[PDB]
Design a protein around this ligand. Structure first.
Ligand SMILES: [Cl-]
Ligand SMILES: [Cl-]
Ligand SMILES: [Hg+2]
Ligand SMILES: [Hg+2]
Ligand SMILES: [Hg+2]
Ligand SMILES: [S]
Length: 256
């Protein structure tokens, strides 16, 4: 599976029949159809920069991993009753600077998207177990709009030189991903899935109401990582966003 004409999104069902499930992500958020839910609390994120651990090129993307041994870095509030432990952050982008986000708002596709993932440590003993459960994961999604360069992304951009090709990894320490979220405490939430294989329907989405910026030159940098292993022929990481999927009756709730 990948994002090419041959093993891409429109072919994932041949292999993962859940790709055509009822709670597939991402989705288009129609602001005229969202539902205000007065029970939604403000999200509370409390991350410990010492839990930052490594950066790795996985082929279709790059992941920034955190030690998830204890509850030093957690997310509380919003729609939840339990606390979710921080395990990673990653990005989605497209072949063009204008259209590469996964979630869309009122039919409008953004430039890119940041996903901050956490697992339910209050009910599951590990991420492996929790990943396939309805309440297993919580992911904060932040829409990225091309404009002014975002200086908060720097340390991440700088680390990329060390993981140019597939399987490469490097220490990535003393970082607080809360530095990347917008000031706004308002969001949309809906039940869904991972946006790539295995496509498990175990994610409760938290989509920020506010977007962050990024310049075209920062995006070109993501686009420059290679999908191939070292020594082979260059194949860039051109794109990795999945098209929106039908809502099939789910409700998108708003905290405002
Ligand atoms: Cl929020
Ligand atoms: Cl995902
Ligand atoms: Hg694309
Ligand atoms: Hg993702
Ligand atoms: Hg948010
Ligand atoms: S946000």
């Amino acid at each position: 599976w990948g994002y090419d004409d041959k093993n891409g999104p429109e072919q994932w069902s041949k292999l993962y029949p859940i790709a055509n499930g009822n709670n597939q992500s991402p989705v288009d958020i129609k602001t005229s159809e969202t539902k205000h839910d007065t029970s939604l609390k403000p999200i509370s994120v409390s991350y410990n920069p010492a839990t930052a651990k490594e950066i790795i090129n996985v082929g279709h993307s790059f992941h920034v991993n955190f030690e998830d041994n204890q509850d030093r870095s957690v997310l509380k509030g919003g729609p939840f009753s339990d606390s979710y432990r921080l395990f990673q952050f990653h990005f989605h982008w497209g072949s063009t600077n204008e259209h590469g986000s996964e979630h869309t708002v009122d039919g409008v596709k953004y430039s890119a998207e940041l996903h901050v993932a956490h697992w339910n440590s209050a009910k599951y003993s590990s991420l492996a177990e929790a990943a396939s459960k309805a309440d297993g994961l919580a992911v904060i999604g932040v829409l990225m709009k091309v404009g002014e360069a975002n200086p908060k992304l720097q340390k991440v951009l700088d680390a990329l030189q060390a993981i140019k090709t597939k399987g490469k990894r490097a220490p990535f320490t003393n970082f607080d991903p809360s530095t990347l979220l917008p000031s706004s405490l308002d969001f949309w939430t809906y039940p869904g899935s991972l946006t790539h294989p295995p496509l498990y329907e175990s994610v409760t989405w938290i989509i920020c109401k506010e977007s962050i910026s990024v310049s075209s030159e920062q995006l070109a940098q993501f686009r420059s990582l290679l999908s191939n292993v070292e020594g082979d022929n260059a194949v860039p990481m051109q794109h990795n966003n999945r098209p929106t999927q039908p809502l099939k009756g789910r409700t998108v709730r708003a905290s405002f």
